[PDB]
Ligand binder design. Sequence first.
Ligand SMILES: O=c1ccn([C@H]2C[C@H](O)[C@@H](COP(=O)(O)NP(=O)(O)OP(=O)(O)O)O2)c(=O)[nH]1
Ligand SMILES: O=c1ccn([C@H]2C[C@H](O)[C@@H](COP(=O)(O)NP(=O)(O)OP(=O)(O)O)O2)c(=O)[nH]1
Ligand SMILES: O=c1ccn([C@H]2C[C@H](O)[C@@H](COP(=O)(O)NP(=O)(O)OP(=O)(O)O)O2)c(=O)[nH]1
Ligand SMILES: [Mg+2]
Ligand SMILES: [Mg+2]
Ligand SMILES: [Mg+2]
Ligand SMILES: [Mg+2]
Ligand SMILES: [Mg+2]
Lengths: 128, 128, 130
Amino acid sequence: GSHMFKVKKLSDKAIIPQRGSKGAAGYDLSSAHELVVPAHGKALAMTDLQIAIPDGTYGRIAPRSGLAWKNFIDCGAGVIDSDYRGNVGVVLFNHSDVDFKVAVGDRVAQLIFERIVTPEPLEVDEID
Amino acid sequence: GSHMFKVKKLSDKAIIPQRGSKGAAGYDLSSAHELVVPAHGKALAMTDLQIAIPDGTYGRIAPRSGLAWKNFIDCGAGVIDSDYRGNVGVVLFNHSDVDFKVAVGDRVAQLIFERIVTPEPLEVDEID
Amino acid sequence: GSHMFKVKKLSDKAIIPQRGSKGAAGYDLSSAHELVVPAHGKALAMTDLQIAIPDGTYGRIAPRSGLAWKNFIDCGAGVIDSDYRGNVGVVLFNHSDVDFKVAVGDRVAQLIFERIVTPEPLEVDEIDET
Ligand SMILES: O=c1ccn([C@H]2C[C@H](O)[C@@H](COP(=O)(O)NP(=O)(O)OP(=O)(O)O)O2)c(=O)[nH]1
Ligand SMILES: O=c1ccn([C@H]2C[C@H](O)[C@@H](COP(=O)(O)NP(=O)(O)OP(=O)(O)O)O2)c(=O)[nH]1
Ligand SMILES: O=c1ccn([C@H]2C[C@H](O)[C@@H](COP(=O)(O)NP(=O)(O)OP(=O)(O)O)O2)c(=O)[nH]1
Ligand SMILES: [Mg+2]
Ligand SMILES: [Mg+2]
Ligand SMILES: [Mg+2]
Ligand SMILES: [Mg+2]
Ligand SMILES: [Mg+2]
């Protein structure tokens, strides 16, 4: 369906992503797992979700602004293809000298459905 | 708003964002404040702008390619929701060994109106 | 104008970007040059490609997921404008404690044609409440 996207929980801990405000760009993504993101290190926060990417778009794992500014947290990777398989994972980057604790249920990113196009590349001799 | 990019200066130091060329993806964002982005550190550069953005889009704070390559500067966070009516700020990351000076009026990022969709989430037991 | 993605090789070492799969978002970008991204450092991996992109888009240099989790590699900069006619360069960031080797032909990023809009900015006194 065009105006809804299906989401299936892979555990009881999974939270259905939802928009924070009427005008929100993204859907909050929460970790389904307790973990720590090491200082100057990286970690995988699995959401325990399968998500069906809308036609004409990819799912972008985008950073929460609070965590970025206060905790020096960022999202690496972040491209969820329309044919991505399985559990959707958030790759967290911590550039601070302080570990970042992640509890089950913590919002760790936001999912944005980026509209894109996918043409077939045409190799040429000259561009004008 | 509807299909517009509206810009309201919050101080006389604010500069209206403009595309560097007709083929540009992004609008130049300038700091309205002097600051330093510490080596291996982060800073918040406010634009002293309040904005309304076109429907079907969020504003993405993207990095300038020059600052990225010469100075190891990046943008953290960067997602400006269509219903944000606060002061638009650029979260700067400095991964280099050297402090990065930012003067009032310096271009520190570029704003891109990313087209997106926002379907409502539909929870299911199975996709496909 | 042009809904097409056109690609001109700038050397014999260049590889035409292609999607890894039918449902893939991005086009694999391969380095056309031997280099190393220094531990805790950055490097330019030129693709030796000149490109023309579809109208209403820019080209985003987006990170590969394997390199990100496995090697702590990220893409810096990454905005390829409609009028960029130079050699497309991948700015690679290495946040690991170990160097990252790049051989010619290595996929180092993926190109995504982001749909965007570019309206004329309007300075106003008043923005509507939210
Ligand atoms: O780089 C940024 C990112 C966000 N913002 C602004 C706009 C955006 O709409 C707003 C987000 O406000 P929130 O307090 O709701 N942060 P978020 O919902 O992303 O969660 P968190 O507070 O943990 O980041 O902050 C910036 O000015 N610059
Ligand atoms: O990762 C990138 C980013 C940009 N580019 C290209 C495309 C883009 O159109 C061009 C921008 O070159 P400049 O250094 O002149 N841009 P500047 O740093 O002056 O500002 P901005 O990056 O905001 O356009 O460089 C790449 O090849 N790879
Ligand atoms: O976002 C991520 C990134 C990595 N991972 C883990 C599991 C996954 O199997 C692996 C990344 O595999 P990819 O298929 O995404 N490799 P990549 O896209 O980088 O390269 P390519 O598709 O060309 O082989 O790392 C995640 O779960 N989520
Ligand atoms: Mg990034
Ligand atoms: Mg970016
Ligand atoms: Mg990948
Ligand atoms: Mg990018
Ligand atoms: Mg650019």
